[PDB]
């Protein structure tokens, strides 16, 4: 940087305080990644100057030529990625996303069916403090209590009971394969929409390691920011049928201007998940995350669903009679950032949960591999095994040292 | 940039195609600015690879003590810039932020009463096609058909037949100063919160040049990207008493994680508001407004309120049996960017208009004072009243390049 360390010294400092914390610590939320300085760039450019209302060819201002040209290299590098008939890039979050397609199908108070939220279902998914719940009648499906996997015997028991207009599937804590077949299978038994909400599995997905749910849905919403490794914003995906009304639905509906510069990065994003190297980088994370559960189960560890096929895994604190909280607290203290995380029957509050949520998208990208799968999930068991050792903590702290330099 | 250009080819020189452009016309949008390099530089920081859902000190995840700080320095200078008890710097956007503080106080199918869209008011304040018309019963004042300043005997007509929860005042294309003292006189008389949408005219306010609606209102909205000449993004600002309920209808209400980057960079834009030079800068914007308006009415044209008080002005091209479509089109041959607007009781639909709406925020920060006002009236001029003249637009396309080199 050179301009805003000479005007903002308070909120430079702050930034190079964050920098310097990124690398240290060992990043473990399941929802973060590190986005490449192509991508920091176009957001950091002039394209934050520039109103587009509207969409590329058809605005609602002139001097978008140039805009039109970025923002139409995102939908065609993600209809690419995706093989979607249809791209919309403009949502500014996940939950805009999401926003923009219950928008699209749903009156007030219309029926939708749901991941159950403590199951692995997203706050976007139907939590009566979000505005999904609030606006719209949520109705839950569960994991099965031993396996921990989607019961789709009760997917459908619940859409032939409540008669839902949309089923979503997708997660933010589920570590196993959704069967999108299935879930358009029931939606299609029902008479309901089906939407997938993608965000944590995106790049998994255009690596071809999860199933696409293209396909099978006829809406697909996910964030740019947490597997796919893009710039902090929202996407929709759908069949060339509701790209009018999905469109409309983003503006003049739930959106107002674009935000250009943020879409010139999912576009940077977009080129880089076309590389050969990203499929690379991918099959790494999904790799990775193998190593890392079975390594936690050799430290004595047992594992919501008893492992991952994605890129994250619940780590089930009961045996060890941790609380989420109290995991996340201590390691912490050791430099491992994790998230307490409810597990599926978890006896405890959300505020305090019964596990943590463990994601390798992070250390992936900054080159981790097997071998240090092995000693994060020895640094956990040395952290969790002796929580009341400030001996034990210090040589945690060394060895998470070790690993980042 | 140095990454992009290597990574991204294609994204690379479309945005140096809009840097250009940028440069190269005379921007008139009324809604558009320039921001500083300090002010991309956080926007292209590492804080867009941080979750921080949640607020300052009470967040929902660990690693937070940074993103926090820079939170807090945006939240305090907005609250020193404007003397409100809360902020929210988190809205994604103008939307986003309105959406927030109608799901706060309303709940669905509530009357609330904005400002006549085809007079001045925004998208956001009930149009049929944007949520908020959807979502909630939208009534209308007017302005005065020969003064078109807003009638507030009109207002306080509609207050009281048609009981409105809440009342907006503020609009996308009104040029004189808003009374909201007797908006909130009027609020208080038929039971109504009031809520104030400053996005236009944030930075006069900031700058002492328009009263300042939040000792008025018990909820103001603004963008950071109009006058306040900040990141593309949203905020709000509330009385204490409603800072709860506010940020929870953020988060978990309709947000998810916020954009840290862009929170980075709307510090580092309050903290340039704070400056004497920014004071200075928004007299000129309004300076230059009013020359603008002056000279343009020298030139033979009508403006709507015969003038304006703050950074915009409406011409009323019926006069000259232009819509406002034509002018923006012709306009656009010769490099002035401006856009088509409808008037106050405008004959023409709002896709083909008899005005255009006009704003000096942008040719401002570049440095534009009286003398170039002058030179842009006479050249809109030379272009309105020869539209049929290739030579006439040739010299204005001429005149246009010697103001912006």
């Known amino acids: 940087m050179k301009y805003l360390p000479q005007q903002d010294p308070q909120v430079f400092a702050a930034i190079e305080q964050e920098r310097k914390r990124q690398h240290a610590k060992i990043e473990l939320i399941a929802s973060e990644n590190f986005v490449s300085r ?3 760039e176009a957001q950091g450019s002039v394209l ?3 109103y587009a209302e509207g969409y590329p060819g058809r605005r609602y201002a002139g001097g978008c030529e140039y ?4 923002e139409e290299l995102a939908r065609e590098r993600a209809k690419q990625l995706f093989g979607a008939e249809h791209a919309n890039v403009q949502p500014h979050s996940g939950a805009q996303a999401n926003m923009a397609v219950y928008f699209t199908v749903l009156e007030h108070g219309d029926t939708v069916l749901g991941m159950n939220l403590s199951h692995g279902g997203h706050l976007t998914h139907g939590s009566p403090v979000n505005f999904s719940g609030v606006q719209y009648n949520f109705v839950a499906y569960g994991v099965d209590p031993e396996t921990h996997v989607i019961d789709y015997d009760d997917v459908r028991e619940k859409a ?3 008669r839902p207009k949309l089923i979503v599937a997708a997660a933010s804590a589920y570590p196993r394969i959704i069967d999108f077949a299935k879930f358009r299978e029931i939606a299609d038994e029902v008479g309901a929409y089906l939407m997938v909400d993608m965000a944590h599995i995106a790049g998994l997905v255009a690596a071809g390691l999860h199933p696409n749910p293209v396909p099978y849905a006829h809406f697909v919403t996910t964030t740019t920011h947490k597997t796919l490794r893009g710039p902090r914003g929202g996407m929709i995906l759908c069949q060339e049928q509701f790209a009018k009304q999905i469109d409309k639905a983003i503006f003049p509906g739930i959106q107002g201007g674009p935000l250009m510069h943020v879409i010139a990065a999912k576009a940077v ?3 880089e998940a076309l590389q050969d190297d990203f499929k690379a980088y991918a099959k790494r994370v999904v ?11 050799n430290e004595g560890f047992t594992l919501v669903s008893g492992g991952t096929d994605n890129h994250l895994l619940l780590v089930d604190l009961r045996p060890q009679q941790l609380t989420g909280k109290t995991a996340e607290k201590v390691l912490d203290e050791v430099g491992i950032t994790v998230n307490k995380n409810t597990i599926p029957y978890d006896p405890e509050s959300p505020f305090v949960t019964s596990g943590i949520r463990i994601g390798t998208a992070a250390v992936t990208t900054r080159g981790f ?3 240090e799968m092995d000693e994060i999930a020895a640094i956990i068991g040395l952290v969790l095994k002796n929580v009341g050792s400030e001996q034990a903590l210090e040589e945690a702290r060394q060895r998470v040292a070790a690993l980042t330099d």
């Open 38 to 40: 192509a991508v920091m």
């Open 48 to 50: 934050t100057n520039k």
């Open 67 to 70: 805009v039109d040209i970025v």
């Open 160 to 162: 032939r009971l409540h």
């Open 269 to 271: 994003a977009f080129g």
């Open 287 to 297: 790799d990775n995350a193998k190593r890392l559960a079975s390594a936690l189960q």
């Open 369 to 371: 591999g097997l071998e």
